[PDB]
Amino acid sequence: QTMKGLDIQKVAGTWYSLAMAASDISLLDAQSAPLRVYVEELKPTPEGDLEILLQKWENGECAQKKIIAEKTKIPAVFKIDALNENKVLVLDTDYKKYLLFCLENSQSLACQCLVRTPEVDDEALEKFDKALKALPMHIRLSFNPTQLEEQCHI
Amino acid sequence: QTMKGLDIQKVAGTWYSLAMAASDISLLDAQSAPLRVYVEELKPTPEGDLEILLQKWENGECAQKKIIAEKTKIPAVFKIDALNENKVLVLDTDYKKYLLFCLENSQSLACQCLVRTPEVDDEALEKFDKALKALPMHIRLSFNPTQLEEQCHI
Ligand SMILES: CCCCNc1ccc(C(=O)OCCN(C)C)cc1
Ligand SMILES: CCCCNc1ccc(C(=O)OCCN(C)C)cc1
């Protein structure tokens, strides 16, 4: 599932990680689990790369991180340069309310439901759950509006 | 949601904790989270109480535990004696394949999908997810057949 006709410039700005799901419990279990990452801001570049500002709990504190996802020939697919080739996939967005994405290796998967506002969007969560229905996810987390306004959703 | 016409004697024997969900991430997050409990065996007593054999990861090892849930005037509701009054609710069972239950305080909630066999029962999981749809759950875990045959689902 990919977003046809994605305009990456229109995903700019503030986002909340309302929900997260992953193929492996260990990817999301603890506050310090590897893919327990809280999106803050998406900053698409003029050349169409994607800078991601996020928070991650590591070494007993809520740390700031900056990821750059490089564009590919497919608008809805980005690459993160590391020891491993990992793909960022944009499944679905309306730009103004929700965005669904997955991070996949070469498989392990973590996906999130991003929303624009610190509110539980049952409709976005329905799109999120329907997107994942056939994906092999074994852990799903969702956050309340109080948590969404805290550093690392504490 | 309670099981009408529950015969507690018919839930005896081997069960697998195929899936678990809870109101609070912290109840299920880590292997050592309080309600990360793996059912082994249900042993109803002649007088209609329920002994539960389970495993729980505590102090760096998979520990054996025995819980007794006392019957109430409602067949599908049991009480666990502690500092807190906690209710065990039997939502649904066919005795031969699946059983859904919740543990609730006075609220925080943890629920499980129990199955008779180390197999992913998509139908039981559908009943589980439909039962929880309006419950305020923020963490959901499910286990693969390999994990289901390991002590504490490692
Ligand atoms: C619209 C796309 C949003 C993408 N958001 C994110 C993309 C990646 C990550 C992320 O945490 O990536 C780290 C994994 N690397 C090191 C392989 C977190 C959020
Ligand atoms: C058919 C009913 C099955 C009930 N199964 C279980 C019931 C209770 C627990 C359980 O872990 O209870 C501990 C909580 N106490 C100390 C308040 C675990 C499993």
Instruction: Name all domains of chain A by residue range, CATH numbers in brackets.
Output: 1-154 (2.40.128.20)
Question: Tokens in use for B19?
Answer: 């899936």
Strand partners of residue A103 = A88, A110
Q: Enumerate the residues of chain A whose CB falls inside 8 A of the CB of residue B150.
A: none
| Interface check B25 vs A, CB under 8 A | yes
* Alpha helix (H) residue ranges in B1-58: none
Q: Which residues of B touch A138 (CB under 8 A)?
A: 141-144
Calpha distance A150→B26 (Å, rounded): 16
Atom in ligand 2 nearest the alpha carbon of residue B8: 1
Paired tokens of A144: 């309340």
The pair of structure tokens assigned to B11 is 């839930």
Give the ligand with the smallest distance to the CA of B15: 2
Distance CA A150, CA B15 (A): 39
In a 10 Å sphere around its CB, with 0-12 CB exposed, 13-18 middle and 19+ buried, how is residue B93 labelled? buried
Q: Which two tokens stand for residue B131?
A: 């039962």
Give the single-character DSSP code of B145. H
Please name the method used to determine this structure: X-ray
What resolution (Å)? Answer: 1.8
- The amino acid that residue B142 corresponds to is S
Q: Is B62 exposed, middle or buried (CB count within 10 Å of its CB: 0-12, 13-18, 19+)?
A: middle
- A49 Cα to chain B: minimum distance (Å): 33
Q: Residues A80, A150, B27, A112: is their CA dihedral positive or negative? A: negative
| Residue B6 contacts residue B75 (beta carbons within 8 Å) | yes
Our measurement of the distance from residue A98's CA atom to the centroid of its chain's CA atoms, rounded to an integer in Å, reads 11
